[PDB]
Write an enzyme that holds these catalytic residues in place. Sequence first.
Site, PDB file in Angstrom:
ATOM      1  N   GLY A 132       2.406   5.707  10.684  1.00 55.99           N
ATOM      2  CA  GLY A 132       3.800   5.500  10.068  1.00 55.99           C
ATOM      3  C   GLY A 132       4.332   4.501  10.411  1.00 55.99           C
ATOM      4  O   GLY A 132       5.475   4.026   9.957  1.00 55.99           O
ATOM      5  N   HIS A 146       0.742  -1.177   0.033  1.00 58.21           N
ATOM      6  CA  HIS A 146       0.190  -0.171   0.050  1.00 58.21           C
ATOM      7  C   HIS A 146       0.835   1.361   0.027  1.00 58.21           C
ATOM      8  O   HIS A 146       0.153   2.348  -0.298  1.00 58.21           O
ATOM      9  CB  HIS A 146      -1.157  -0.214   1.069  1.00 58.21           C
ATOM     10  N   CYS A 202       3.309   1.199   9.830  1.00 60.13           N
ATOM     11  CA  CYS A 202       3.224   0.071   8.965  1.00 60.13           C
ATOM     12  C   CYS A 202       4.584  -0.327   8.390  1.00 60.13           C
ATOM     13  O   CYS A 202       5.530   0.653   8.262  1.00 60.13           O
ATOM     14  CB  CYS A 202       2.204   0.203   7.796  1.00 60.13           C
TER      15      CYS A 202
HETATM   16  C1  LIG Z   1       1.424   3.079   7.584  1.00 55.83           C
HETATM   17  N1  LIG Z   1       0.882   2.610   8.851  1.00 55.83           N
HETATM   18  C2  LIG Z   1      -0.226   3.365   9.617  1.00 55.83           C
HETATM   19  C3  LIG Z   1      -0.798   2.871  11.086  1.00 55.83           C
HETATM   20  C4  LIG Z   1      -1.442   3.912  11.767  1.00 55.83           C
HETATM   21  C5  LIG Z   1      -1.939   3.216  12.873  1.00 55.83           C
HETATM   22  C6  LIG Z   1      -1.795   1.712  13.391  1.00 55.83           C
HETATM   23  N2  LIG Z   1      -1.076   1.168  12.424  1.00 55.83           N
HETATM   24  C7  LIG Z   1      -0.526   1.527  11.375  1.00 55.83           C
HETATM   25  N3  LIG Z   1      -0.302   4.413   9.139  1.00 55.83           N
HETATM   26  C8  LIG Z   1       0.137   5.024   8.058  1.00 55.83           C
HETATM   27  C9  LIG Z   1      -0.211   6.418   7.576  1.00 55.83           C
HETATM   28  C10 LIG Z   1       0.368   6.741   6.298  1.00 55.83           C
HETATM   29  C11 LIG Z   1       1.033   6.127   5.550  1.00 55.83           C
HETATM   30  C12 LIG Z   1       1.468   4.752   5.951  1.00 55.83           C
HETATM   31  C13 LIG Z   1       1.064   4.261   7.163  1.00 55.83           C
END
Ligand SMILES: *c1nc(-c2cccnc2)nc2ccccc12
Lengths: 301, 306
Positions: free
Chosen positions: A143, A41, A145
């Site tokens: 962030g 993603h 992930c």
């Molecule tokens: C990747 N992971 C998250 C996330 C937020 C909360 C809990 N788990 C994972 N949020 C984002 C936001 C933007 C880009 C990548 C990403």
Amino acid sequence: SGFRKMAFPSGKVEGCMVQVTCGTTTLNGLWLDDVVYCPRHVICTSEDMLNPNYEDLLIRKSNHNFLVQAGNVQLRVIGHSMQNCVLKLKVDTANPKTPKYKFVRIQPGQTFSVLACYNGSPSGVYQCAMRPNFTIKGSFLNGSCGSVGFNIDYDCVSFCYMHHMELPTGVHAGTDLEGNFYGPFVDRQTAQAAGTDTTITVNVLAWLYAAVINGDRWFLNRFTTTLNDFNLVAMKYNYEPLTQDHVDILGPLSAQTGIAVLDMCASLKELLQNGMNGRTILGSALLEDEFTPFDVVRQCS
Amino acid sequence: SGFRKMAFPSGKVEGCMVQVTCGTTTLNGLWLDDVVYCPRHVICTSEDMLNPNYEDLLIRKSNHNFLVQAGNVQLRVIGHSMQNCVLKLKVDTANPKTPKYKFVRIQPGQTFSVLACYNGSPSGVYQCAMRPNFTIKGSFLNGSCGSVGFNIDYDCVSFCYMHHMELPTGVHAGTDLEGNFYGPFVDRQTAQAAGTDTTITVNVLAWLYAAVINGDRWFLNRFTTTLNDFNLVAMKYNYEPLTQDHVDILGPLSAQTGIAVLDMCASLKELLQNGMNGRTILGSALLEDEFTPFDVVRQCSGVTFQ
Ligand SMILES: *c1nc(-c2cccnc2)nc2ccccc12
Ligand SMILES: *c1nc(-c2cccnc2)nc2ccccc12
Ligand SMILES: [Cl-]
Ligand code: NA
Ligand code: NA
Ligand code: NA
């Protein structure tokens, strides 16, 4: 002695964490030999959130659209492919800190360490279990992930989880390192919900054996049970069924403590019926279910 | 979302752990620059440990009596001296993985990460608080002495603890890296016991703030209190006093959540007087006291340690 939620030392994984950027999207990746693994993603836009066509998005990208930063240095991306829900970026440098490793897909009940990371840099390490509904109860912010979960039983790192997203109830979903989701989830922002979660019975039993090994006896009783009668009671408290596999796995702890598995099952039935009445077991006033039988033997012996 | 007991990433410390042997005693050491630090009781046997004369044992020792192994390499010991309850072994090679570091002494209530090690090999990492009775509730087996505790502040490792021994009640005692014990303990095999322990009030308040940040709000109420009234109740329940400094440190969490510290104290007062009435907070049925205010802000804000 003592009994603590304990993680694996994180240094072998720290030396593999990098930052991956595509467009305005930044997240974490895992650099092993000459490949960086990250959630696919990373190639999505704001447009793409509900029904991304990842094959379509990926064909439109070139190598130079991916920025990979390892510490202070940019790595050159020389190839890209997708496997299930993970992106693989071939880079022109093998990671000199690559540990001995393997990829393993785990089952519900299994435990692992998570190295929570932001912008390719480690924030902290904690211990998790794959819940019966195929979520994990982690600690993850925007962030995060691309952070991974792992075990290290000898000098070989077993990567078992890559973090993708948070569901509305605040629990966490992700994939194995071949990009297959745990559970019925997809990497789309369409409505999805986890099943009602249940308690990992075999792990609670393991933890009761840990308590006995550490000198706690108060919850033991003189009864035994049939496996079937145990499961009929346990299910009424949203406990997972105990299988004969689980009975067999508890055999070594049973032998070490001199308490038969079905004897311990009857102790658990009583605890569910009575509560703890102001007492604690290994410092807890609730029954703990995120230590496996293997974990108990490792930490106690 | 979510809130977990979280340790610092341990990689910077892992690259400093070595094995030290003297006679039939093996334990862990910490190799920083050209010095290996370890417990002085490495020079003792069983009988020595009944009533050790460390000065006398040490003066008799040759450099070659200390075997230091770093992975599968032997380091050459070229000197030895003692500082308080730690032995310092000068070696002929600087550790190339030496991180930026300082030695600090912590106060009761402060938290740190422990890297549990055996035969110079890191086996586990967990988070601990220095208890008000100066013990830690660790998890440690034979051979664990010399394992260390630490924090990371920016890119600097602050070493604050070296593990020495287990008391009869199964809790743990050790020193700072200058060899001074936390608490009224000595490095000998005799009956010793820690004082009655108390609950770290400021940390329980921090954890209630973490709960609110994570959406767990049922224990909030409309009341506030005074520091003096709250401290009388805390005393009654074997909670440590809350000072004005503690109130000040929680200021940021109060601002962020809209719950003033003495408003949160009135929640805690009620929990102590009435219990949880079948409910849990962040999945616990007990009040947790091993998260500091700093820990809560760090974990709820995503600070990193490249
Ligand atoms: C990747 N992971 C998250 C996330 C937020 C909360 C809990 N788990 C994972 N949020 C984002 C936001 C933007 C880009 C990548 C990403
Ligand atoms: C060092 N430490 C211990 C020990 C055991 C249990 C808990 N804490 C520390 N035990 C040993 C045994 C032999 C040699 C060193 C050593
Ligand atoms: Cl009021
Ligand atoms: Na990194
Ligand atoms: Na029984
Ligand atoms: Na209030």
